[PDB]
Amino acid sequence: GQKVHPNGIRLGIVKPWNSTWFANTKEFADNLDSDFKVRQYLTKELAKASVSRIVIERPAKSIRVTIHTARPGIVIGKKGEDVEKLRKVVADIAGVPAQINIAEVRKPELDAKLVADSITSQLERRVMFRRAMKRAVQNAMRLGAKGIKVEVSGRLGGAEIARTEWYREGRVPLHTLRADIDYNTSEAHTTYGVIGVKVWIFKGEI
Template identity: 55%
Template sequence: MGQKVNPIGFRLGVVRGWDSNWYGGKDFPSKLVEDQEIRKYIDARIPKGGISKVIIERTIKRITITVHTARPGVVIGKGGQEVDRIKEELKKLTGKDVQINIFEIKRPELDAKLVGESIAQQLKARISYRRAMKQAIASAVRVGAQGIKIKCSGRLGGAEMARTEMYKDGRIPLHTLRADIDYAISEADTVYGKIGIKVWIFKGEVFGKRDLSPNVGASNQMGGDRDRRGGGARRPNRNKKK
């Protein structure tokens, strides 16, 4: 099953937190659509911001948005002007008070979304797909990735027939739930058509309890010293001889 299912959805609640944290009730459909509109707006508003993901939390009167970005200076703007404009525009879009938090991604080479977008930009600039994929793999391994796999599909190099090519280094244990695997899909609009890019990055196995709260860097921090398999203190052995 691990080979087919989305690696992120497969690990929700185990080593990965949700990107939307709220209870919708009867208004669930409208809030879900609003979340998608917020994410599309932020991506379109700051196309060069190096944004990996946008986490949204809701209360009755406030929406808290945490933007994970590799370029916080671009998102914040000079003196915070850019983020203030975004906040005001999102207030008009949602009709609620909006709070925006910025979370810096210190190692973008280990973020599947940013790696995929980087390869897509290189393909648009007509750089060889093999060179772009191999450079991304080398960079990820150099900064500490235990495994990385990149797959490109489409008219690679302008070929008449579409095909798929894949490069891999290290291991990607898709069946292991405690494995911290990041996954993303990107698209490159080239003169020959669209090229799909899939990226898997294995960062290591998580032992113990991980804090899944988004506002403390859910994807990069671990806390607690209890083993997940134990679930707390051990039961006393009642069969032990006295």
């Protein structure tokens, strides 16, 4: 293994950051755990609500928390209802009060995470891995996407002896720092083990 994480090396440039708050040495840790505690609960909840990314901020003695989903309604519930029962517990876990916006995922086929997640959720469903990989890569090149690669790994279909197998269609310059690359991950928990999904989606540049 020897590929710099694609998202990571971009943060400074072209890629964002899924936490943005400021804190000093003291509370910096206490915050991290909080954050990784809220993204924890929330992801187990909106699991079947196609969530692709959750940002956090703590605007002075308060916690904001945006939730990038490709099923905005399902997250929000009957006229606000759900978001309430979230905010509720999300403030119970942050130790402070909690707003909680719900960003919309246009063209989810373009989100690496929601891509992987489906491929993951397809193996658990019990589907051909070559098939899923190929659906993914298509409806993607379809709705734009100057490129995409998805690879899987480990007992593909059942093998006693494990494999990787990828699919690079288009352009995916992982060495260009300008290049917009949405890179994410998801693991299938199957009856014969655990299958790792990486997906790269090449969007543009500058």
